[PDB]
Design a binder for this molecule. Structure first.
Ligand code: A1AYO
Ligand code: A1AYO
Length: 209
């Protein structure tokens, strides 16, 4: 049972800009996704200060980077607060709409794509390198869900039947054909050190077999 939703016109028109605009500095997608993971870890950590039972779904707060050359996928895993069903359909779209509109006014006023994080819509930077993004998320107050979109104006939301996650968000980037450099070990290390050096959570690179 999969529900298909239409992107808001402002968001879909931002995603088409990100996918079609010639922009070589694509490496900033990792900074934006890690920064989003850092924010999610900050939220569950703050909640645990007054309610230790919020960590019953997982005490460790970290970010894991899992490249896969065979599947041509780069996975960013965090144990943050996760996302509810209302987040994936209603709440985050409201924040995305106001942030997208402001980001696009700035893009016409000289700003470039790399400043997407200053508007709170840094997740859409994943489509600089990915032709399809699958998001597995689990919130303490909801069930595990699967978000997926190949852009094109629509996304899907469904209950995830796969491996239980406990708590957090897993972003699976199905990379484009010419973006496989972000599956290399030394390339990921250079980007993490350059852009995410001061993230207050351990970022572990899972190196392949
Ligand atoms: N509308 C809307 C829904 C989810 C997101 N989102 C942010 N981080 C991840 Cl992962 C996802 Cl999915 C963004 C916008
Ligand atoms: N709380 C909260 C979580 C994620 C986002 N977010 C990031 N990238 C996009 Cl797109 C969105 Cl929406 C915004 C707020």
């Amino acid at each position: 049972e999969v529900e298909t939703f239409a992107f808001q016109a402002e968001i879909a028109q931002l995603m088409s800009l990100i996918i079609n605009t010639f922009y070589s500095n694509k490496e900033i997608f990792l900074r934006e996704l890690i920064s989003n993971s850092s924010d999610a870890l900050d939220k569950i950590r703050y909640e645990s200060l007054t309610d230790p039972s919020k960590l019953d779904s997982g005490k460790e707060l970290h970010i894991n980077l899992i490249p896969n050359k065979q599947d041509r996928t780069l996975t960013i895993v965090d144990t943050g607060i996760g996302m509810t069903k209302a987040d994936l359909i209603n709440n985050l779209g409201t924040i995305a709409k106001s942030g997208t509109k402001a980001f696009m006014e700035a893009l016409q006023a000289g700003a470039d794509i790399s400043m997407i994080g200053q508007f709170g819509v840094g997740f859409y930077s994943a489509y600089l390198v990915a032709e399809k993004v699958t998001v597995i998320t689990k919130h303490n107050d909801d069930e595990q869900y699967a978000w997926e979109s190949s852009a094109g104006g629509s996304f899907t939301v469904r209950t995830d039947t796969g491996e239980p996650m406990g708590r957090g968000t897993k972003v699976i980037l199905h990379l484009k054909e010419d973006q496989t450099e972000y599956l290399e070990e030394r390339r990921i290390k250079e980007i993490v050190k350059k852009h995410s050096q001061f993230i207050g959570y351990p970022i572990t690179l899972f190196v392949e077999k």
